[PDB]
């Protein structure tokens, strides 16, 4: 019994060293190379485990049902069921047998080939055949391609087959004139630090007919990942990159010869898109004759992913941002279908996946506007657009009378002198301000006063009925919205600042369209939806239906009134209920504060579409309302 317990320890330490990949440490736990003991030496056990387990990408060896007894005066037998992960999946229910040796003061494993795999004998080899699985596509709500796979021709000269003296300068002038390339551009690439005489320098990506090949040039077909919308959906869709040895060590079921999603939906849906690798892991004879198969699957290509995105709306929403920093979200507010998730500025996802230069990559990363950011999933303060929510909350708890007229003298206001150098600012100078006037002229002083009059307790009670703190069921990396940093404002300034969408509010554009959907569903919040086949989920009785029928007519006047902040949208001649907004931002790298311009708009007649757009750090004379005319035309004509 005293030695039977030590035998179970050496078996588990042997399994652990194999599981941890340290085959040398496991090999040093075996007995001497002899008959009825260890078949191979230590270094030969190391090389056999490193070759066989390395060929199959064996990882995560776990054993169970360990039983160790006694057979002779010094021979102990062990047995256990085992499972492991390979590049062909999980290899479960393995019956491993073996014997031990207790010669001196230690216990060693009488190593045999049957410990690499259950039924191995002597010079038994291990063969592994694999077939790559084609990556699935990503399509919009109408089947248009957003991320597809295709073959591309890779033109490239060979330095050794190009020439010697004079014949090199002639064959370079022909490999450049026949493919429409500047002649001075071939020498700068076939002379880089990585170039070798017998290598292949990839020149141009042919996208049509392959012309006559001069002396030195040769085509190379490569499977590529294409993005039709390009940068217009780069943040949402993401990109794929070459799979590295580190990726295979974390997940052996990947194809070391394929691609892996690095960001966006390509990474979120990497498993569904990449499929499963087909092939066969077998044991052969000493010559190569197949004995027993261990694993065998057929190749299963990845499943396509259909989104709620509109490919034409995604491109229009992105192009309307004109490369400036900002984001735009379009939904069908009654269902939650995310029609467009645009973020600007952006990066080239095709250039990102088909070989990106370190110069261009550093430009993307050092760009102060940060094109890599998915701005539709980044927490922002909603700005004075949030006056709708505060007003709706005020109408519900009986604080705000739509016909009561507050008197506001001047453009700056504060509760008293304790506020110091903080003052709520009104854009327009309007003395008599009611609820309809505050929404038309975008008056923050009215909202700040009504927020303080409402009180923090009533204000949070109405705010808590929304989606603050909730995790949206979306395949987009995202943090939940927050009202403030803590559960209590502990500040009348922060309370008033939060009233008109400033303060410590953090709500990303997707969460904004979710909260704002209550005005298109009679007070019911409809959760956003990115996957087309998913079921519509909602949250009823968020705000009172009376508040919706009181505010939406005012939001019509934000467009129709001659002094409405979105009056330029009446040029469209379409039914619009809108609400502009600005968020005052103060960052450290600048002395004067910045400003974020917002526009919320939806069709108040049919509730077919809803838009939430933002310009981050707006330039002068620029706004989100000025850039939304094109998208509103498309959404109104195609989503009724």
């Amino acid at each position: 019994t005293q030695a039977v317990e030590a035998g179970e320890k050496t078996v588990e330490q042997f399994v652990q060293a194999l599981n941890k990949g340290d085959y040398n440490k496991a090999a040093e736990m075996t007995s001497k190379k002899a008959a009825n003991k260890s078949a191979l030496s230590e270094k030969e056990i190391l090389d056999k485990y490193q070759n066989i387990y390395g060929a199959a990408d064996v990882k995560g060896l776990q054993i169970s049902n360990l039983k160790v007894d006694k057979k002779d005066d010094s021979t102990y037998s062990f047995s256990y069921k085992a499972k492991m992960n390979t590049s062909l999946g999980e290899l479960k229910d393995l019956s491993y047998k073996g014997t031990l040796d207790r010669n001196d003061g230690q216990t060693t494993i009488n190593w045999q080939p049957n410990l690499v795999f259950p039924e191995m004998e002597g010079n038994d080899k291990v063969s592994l055949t694999t077939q790559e699985a084609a990556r699935g596509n990503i399509i919009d709500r109408n089947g248009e391609p957003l991320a597809t796979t295709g073959k591309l021709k890779q033109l490239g000269v060979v330095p050794s087959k190009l020439g010697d003296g004079g014949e090199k300068t002639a064959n370079i002038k022909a490999i450049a004139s026949s493919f429409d390339l500047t002649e001075d551009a071939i020498n700068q690439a076939i002379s880089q630090s990585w170039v070798q005489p017998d290598y292949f320098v990839p020149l141009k990506i042919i996208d049509g007919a392959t012309p006559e090949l001069p002396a030195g040039a040769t085509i190379q077909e490569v499977d590529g990942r294409y993005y039709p919308l390009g940068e217009a959906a780069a943040q949402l869709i993401g990109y794929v990159g070459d799979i590295t040895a580190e990726d295979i060590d974390k997940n052996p079921e990947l194809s070391s010869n394929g691609k892996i999603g690095r960001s966006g939906l390509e990474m979120a849906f990497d498993k569904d898109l990449r499929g499963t690798t087909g092939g066969k892991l077998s044991i052969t004879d000493a010559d190569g004759v197949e004995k027993k198969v261990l694993i065998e699957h057929e190749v299963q290509n990845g499943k396509d992913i259909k989104l709620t995105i509109d490919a034409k709306a995604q491109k229009t929403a992105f192009d309307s941002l004109g490369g400036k920093a900002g984001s735009t979200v379009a939904t069908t507010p009654k269902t939650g279908d995310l029609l467009a998730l645009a973020s600007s500025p952006s990066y080239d996802p095709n250039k990102m996946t088909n070989g990106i230069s370190q110069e261009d990559y550093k430009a993307y990363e050092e760009n102060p506007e940060q094109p890599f950011i998915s701005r539709f999933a980044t927490g922002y303060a909603p700005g004075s657009t949030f006056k709708m929510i505060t007003a709706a909350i005020g109408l519900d708890n009986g604080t705000i009378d739509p016909n009561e007229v507050l008197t506001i003298n001047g453009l700056k206001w504060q509760k008293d002198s304790s506020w110091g150098s903080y003052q709520v600012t009104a854009v327009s100078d309007v003395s008599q301000v009611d609820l309809k006037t505050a929404l038309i002229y975008s008056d923050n002083i009215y909202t700040a006063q009504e927020t303080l009059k409402m009180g923090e307790k009533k204000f949070r009670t109405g705010l808590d009925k929304f989606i603050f703190g909730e995790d949206l069921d979306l395949p987009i990396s995202m943090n939940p919205a927050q009202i403030s940093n803590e559960d209590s404002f502990n500040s009348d300034i922060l309370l008033a600042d939060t009233g008109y969408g400033q303060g410590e509010l953090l709500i990303n554009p997707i969460q904004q369209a979710a909260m704002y959907s209550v005005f298109a569903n009679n007070g019911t919040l409809v959760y956003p939806k990115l996957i087309a086949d998913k079921e519509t989920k909602d949250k009823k009785n968020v705000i009172g239906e009376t508040a919706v029928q009181t505010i939406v007519p005012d939001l019509r006047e934000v467009v129709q009134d001659v002094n409405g902040t979105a009056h330029s949208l009446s040029a469209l001649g379409i039914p619009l209920a809108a609400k502009t907004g600005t968020a005052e931002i103060k960052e450290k790298q600048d002395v004067k504060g910045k400003e974020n311009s917002f526009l919320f708009a939806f069709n108040p007649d049919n509730q077919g579409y809803m838009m939430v757009s933002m310009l981050e750090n707006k330039e002068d004379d620029d706004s989100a309302t000025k850039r939304a005319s094109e998208l509103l035309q498309y959404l109104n004509q195609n989503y009724q």
Side-chain angles (χ1 to χ4, degrees), residues 575-591 593 595-634:
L576 279 176
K579 183 68 192 69
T580 67
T582 85
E584 298 146 350
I585 307 303
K586 178 57 180 59
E587 294 170 344
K588 296 186 178 182
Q589 64 274 22
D590 45 70
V591 280
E595 182 175 331
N596 290 338
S597 185
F598 295 82
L599 171 59
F600 158 77
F602 76 105
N603 194 323
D605 289 359
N606 54 37
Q607 296 84 22
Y609 68 93
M610 173 173 290
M611 180 192 58
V612 175
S613 179
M614 171 193 56
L615 283 191
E616 180 184 356
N617 185 22
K618 51 158 279 175
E619 301 172 346
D620 293 330
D621 313 330
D622 201 6
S623 70
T625 305
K626 192 169 58 65
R627 303 174 174 271
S629 54
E630 288 190 359
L631 180 62
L632 286 179
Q633 274 184 305
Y634 175 82

Side-chain angles (χ1 to χ4, degrees), residues 389 392-393 396-397 457-468 470 483 514-515 518 523-525 527 539-544:
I389 305 303
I393 293 172
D396 284 354
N397 54 32
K457 195 172 184 299
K458 300 182 193 291
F459 186 40
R460 290 191 177 273
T461 293
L463 287 171
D464 291 332
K465 290 202 262 288
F466 285 83
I467 60 170
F468 285 101
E470 301 185 9
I483 299 174
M515 301 194 314
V518 296
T524 293
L525 185 144
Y527 285 96
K539 187 173 185 292
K540 314 215 70 177
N541 293 331
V542 168
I543 61 171

Side-chain angles (χ1 to χ4, degrees), residues 107-144:
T107 302
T108 55
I109 290 88
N110 296 335
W111 189 92
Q112 295 289 301
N114 60 12
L115 299 187
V116 183
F117 287 114
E119 296 172 346
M120 304 226 312
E121 298 170 344
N123 302 333
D124 272 334
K125 319 298 189 61
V126 176
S127 174
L128 175 54
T129 306
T130 52
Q131 183 140 319
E132 266 180 297
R135 174 169 263 261
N137 298 334
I138 306 181
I139 55 180
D140 77 329
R141 64 189 297 103
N142 297 319
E144 295 291 335

Side-chain angles (χ1 to χ4, degrees), residues 355-361 363-397:
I356 173 75
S357 65
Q358 279 295 133
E359 191 189 46
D360 292 358
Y361 176 76
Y364 283 144
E365 200 171 15
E366 298 167 359
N367 194 325
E369 290 183 329
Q370 292 290 285
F372 284 158
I373 296 187
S374 296
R375 284 179 161 80
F376 42 76
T378 305
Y380 294 93
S384 52
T385 319
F386 205 71
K387 291 192 297 288
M388 317 173 304
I389 305 303
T390 302
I393 293 172
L395 297 174
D396 284 354
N397 54 32

Side-chain angles (χ1 to χ4, degrees), residues 11 15 63-66 78-82 94 96 115:
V11 170
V15 168
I63 63 109
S64 58
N65 198 350
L66 178 60
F78 60 86
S79 60
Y80 55 83
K81 293 300 244 60
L94 289 183
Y96 276 89
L115 299 187

Side-chain angles (χ1 to χ4, degrees), residues 8 23 48 56 107 116 183 234 303 334 340 403 442 454 469 471 473 520 536 543 586 615:
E8 293 183 337
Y23 310 118
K48 181 159 287 295
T107 302
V116 183
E183 183 174 344
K303 299 181 177 182
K334 292 193 294 184
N403 302 318
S442 183
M454 181 189 315
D471 278 320
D473 185 61
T536 297
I543 61 171
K586 178 57 180 59
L615 283 191

Side-chain angles (χ1 to χ4, degrees), residues 110 115 157 189 208 222 246 255 291 301 314 331 357 387 475 503 519 535 567 573 583 589 614:
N110 296 335
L115 299 187
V157 296
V222 285
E246 254 289 329
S255 182
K291 288 177 50 186
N301 300 330
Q314 175 77 22
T331 66
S357 65
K387 291 192 297 288
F519 301 103
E535 190 178 9
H567 181 76
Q589 64 274 22
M614 171 193 56

